[PDB]
Amino acid sequence: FASKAEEKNYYERQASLAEFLTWYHQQYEKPSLTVDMVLLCYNKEADQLKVLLIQRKGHPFRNSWALPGGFVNRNESTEDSVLRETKEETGVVISQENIEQLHSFSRPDRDPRGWVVTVSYLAFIGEEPLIAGDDAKEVHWFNLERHGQHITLSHEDVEITLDLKTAASLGKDTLAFDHSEIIIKAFNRVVDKMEHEPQVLQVLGKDFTITEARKVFAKFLGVDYRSIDHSNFKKAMTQYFEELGERPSKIYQLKT
Amino acid sequence: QFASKAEEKNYYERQASLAEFLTWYHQQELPEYEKPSLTVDMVLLCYNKEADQLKVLLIQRKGHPFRNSWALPGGFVNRNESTEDSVLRETKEETGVVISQENIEQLHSFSRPDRDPRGWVVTVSYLAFIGEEPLIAGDDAKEVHWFNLERHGQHITLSHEDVEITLDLKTAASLGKDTLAFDHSEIIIKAFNRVVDKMEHEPQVLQVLGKDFTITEARKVFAKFLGVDYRSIDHSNFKKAMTQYFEELGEPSKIYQLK
């Protein structure tokens, strides 16, 4: 060959596949590839919808809260990495039945250290898992609630407020990277899906009563659960449930 | 000054401003690890009214991997570009079609570790509903065509001339003469099922109808995705269930746009 491409043209257009791949491997820039997870649980005893956050110790975004997540390994899909990273983080075994790919975040400077693309996922964890204390990391299941077009993620005196329409983060307590966009994407995804695909009810664990399911919907709607008519709820939603069994209240499971 | 490597790095992470963090950070010898190539692929759907034909744009690849196979248009994202920017640039370079950001939606990212014979390659796919534009091949496309797309039960067929690609809507199994490059059969099935899943409560797909439409046209689009005769979708029940997403004006039947 007389130069660079060339060369490029012969291997792509005339050579055999094997011959192409050999030349290809012997030699565009590449991003770091990660996953981030909006892990949702429900605490039946507090009647609280919760989402996991970890404070960064830790420039960039020192003292901002971040979603859990991590690097995708070469031999796994991002779905595989979510199952692995969630187990590492929380100790809970989920399957892909428990996750939903949300959106890929790729603003070239989203991480100012270098080129990092993330594939974000919602995952429904069941009951709130315990965290054994560790001063090396600030990690809590934050209460999640909604008022009108805003959501609040709180833990003690930490209060994070997000606009569901703009993704704007409104208080002194902040989220890292583009995690506020990820979190509202996840919230709005559940809101727009749940009436006709209530996967979100897996936050109730292995079974649920209709009233429990109504409480979950109320949290995402930003209303008092007493204001959701129980009967019209039951009627609309029961085509998605399978009766398990049970003074004793009737229990259900999602069908699939 | 420092002392140890450990002391230096947490002074910059934990004490320094962001500013100095970031000035210090970019001058460091960063440990190396494997990274994927990042690509984008685009599912362009239109609808011909006279023909009652859903169509999907495919290109015939001129270079390896999958030389001469039909494929979605797509390509490598550059470091200084979001995937959104990149898919719009690749679609234009490869097909001649100009779409705006507001008119694409991200569909799904495919990351199966062996989906590309080049090695670790991850794709962010996109979906858009557009007119049946004139097409011009870019250099890497031997041909570019609007393929006829038809649903038959749980299968869809993409056809152009003697090319025939038939996909199973539940397994992405490929039953036809021709086989899509890469994992593009999975991507087309994902796009097709996403529209079926969304159109009843978010009818963005009616964009293929071009800014105004009757209830009969909307029914005909819905039936092409459902794989039924439009006449089996009651006009009066459809008018009532869907109007909430509609506008427009009149008229000796009514014209609507999406709102």
3-state secondary structure A19-88: HHHHHHHHCCCCCEEEEEEEEEEEECCCCEEEEEEEECCCCCCCCCEECCEEECCCCCCHHHHHHHHHHH
- CATH number for A193-256 (one of 3.40.920.10, 1.10.357.10, 1.10.10.10, 3.40.50.10880): it is 1.10.10.10
Q: Which helix (H) or strand (E) holds B190?
A: helix B184-198
Bridge partners, B139 (sequence order): none
- In contact, B257 and B247? CB cutoff 8 Å: yes
* Cα angle for residues A224, A229, A232 (degrees, 5° grid): 140
CATH topology of domain B1-33: Helix Hairpins (1.10.287)
- In contact, A149 and A188? CB cutoff 8 Å: no
CA dihedral B125, B130, B136, B137 (to 10 degrees): 20
CATH topology of domain B34-197: Nucleoside Triphosphate Pyrophosphohydrolase (3.90.79)
Tokens at A70, concatenated: 């991590």
Q: For the purposes of burial, counting CB atoms within 10 Å of the CB of A159, is it exposed (0-12), middle (13-18) or buried (19 or more)? A: middle
Domain A1-28's class? Answer: mainly alpha
- In contact, A141 and A52? CB cutoff 8 Å: yes
Measured distance CA(B250)–CA(B256) in Å, rounded: 8
- In contact, B110 and B123? CB cutoff 8 Å: yes
Out of B36, B81, B84, closest to residue A33 by CB: B36
- CATH number for B198-259 (one of 3.30.2080.10, 3.50.50.60, 3.30.559.10, 1.10.10.10): it is 1.10.10.10
Residue closest to A124 by CA, chosen among A82, A62, A80: A82
Residue type at B121 in one-letter notation: V
Residue B16: its chain A contacts at CB < 8 A? 59
- Which residue numbers of A have CB closer than 8 Å to B's CBs? 11-13, 15, 17, 20-21, 24-25, 28-33, 57-60, 62, 71-72, 74-79, 101, 103-104, 106-108, 112-115, 117, 119, 192, 195-196
Measured distance CA(B77)–CA(B84) in Å, rounded: 9
Based on C-alpha coordinates, what's the Rg of chain B?
A: 23
Q: For the purposes of burial, counting CB atoms within 10 Å of the CB of A203, is it exposed (0-12), middle (13-18) or buried (19 or more)? A: buried
Q: Tally Cβ neighbours within 10 Å of residue A213.
A: 25
**What three-state secondary structure class fits B46?**
strand
- CATH number for A29-192 (one of 2.60.40.10, 3.40.50.300, 3.90.79.10, 3.40.50.620): it is 3.90.79.10
* Cα angle for residues A193, A194, A199 (degrees, 5° grid): 105
Q: Residues B110, B114, B116, B118: is their CA dihedral positive or negative?
A: positive
Tokens at B23, concatenated: 């000035």
Measured distance CA(B219)–CA(B226) in Å, rounded: 10
- In contact, A101 and A121? CB cutoff 8 Å: yes
Based on C-alpha coordinates, what's the Rg of chain A?
A: 22
Measured distance CA(B258)–CA(B246) in Å, rounded: 5
Residue A199: its chain B contacts at CB < 8 A? none
Tokens at B218, concatenated: 């909307």
**What three-state secondary structure class fits A138?**
coil
Per-domain boundaries in chain B: 1-33, 34-197, 198-259
DSSP one-letter code for B176: S
Measured distance CA(A191)–CA(A144) in Å, rounded: 14
CA distances from B19 to A115, A124, A177, A192 (A): 18, 38, 16, 40
